[PDB]
Symmetry: C2
Subunit: 135 residues, 2 copies
Amino acid sequence: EIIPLGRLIHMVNQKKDRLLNEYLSPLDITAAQFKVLCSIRCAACITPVELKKVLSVDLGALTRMLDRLVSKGWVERLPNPNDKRGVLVKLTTGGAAICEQCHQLVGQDLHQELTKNLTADEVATLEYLLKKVLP
Amino acid sequence: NEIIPLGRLIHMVNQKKDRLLNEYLSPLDITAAQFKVLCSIRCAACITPVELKKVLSVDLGALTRMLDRLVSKGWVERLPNPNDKRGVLVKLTTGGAAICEQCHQLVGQDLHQELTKNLTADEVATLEYLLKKVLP
């Protein structure tokens, strides 16, 4: 069973997303919708284009999603002080709160599920070596 | 040197992988999304757009357009579904099969080399071993 690193990372990622959808279920929010809120939360404000690059998802589907999240009262559109034709999406008070709830609900359990087949010893090594791939 | 949880680490390393994938694919005029499609169609010999939307977790709108683009390129052909008549079965052409293989070769080596740049071979071995453990 030799499997290349690239594909293993993909598979483990997909599994993480399955579990994300599961653990986010009580808050009626998908993993895709959640990743959006987080990305917007990391930058005070961000444009749909800039958000498309960070997330690596289709612009059309993302624009529909951005409008879903506006109806939910989680995301608002400020006009860009720079562009005035593009908009800056940011989180609402409700969005920021819902996003933090999502973190509080998902965080510990997802990690605990992903790492059930591993020792805390092996967990440390895995985190360490994944860190080495990043810079 | 800060404790980043496994969940977020996998996202960052995956996102890095996807970006490097787009790089090593520009020279052949085919996008990363287009490439994933061909691979999924390759793996299941024949597949419904519906069934393919599920495997890629993409938008059916974007996929139908992306399928149209790949039909233009002559990499993907539509057969009528013998089981349905309202659906189609997309599959790869010889051309599309060649290109999919050629992309897997062109990026198969280099993506790996680039990802494992800062890693010993023993560390890479250890890394793959522990990732596999997360999958059952």
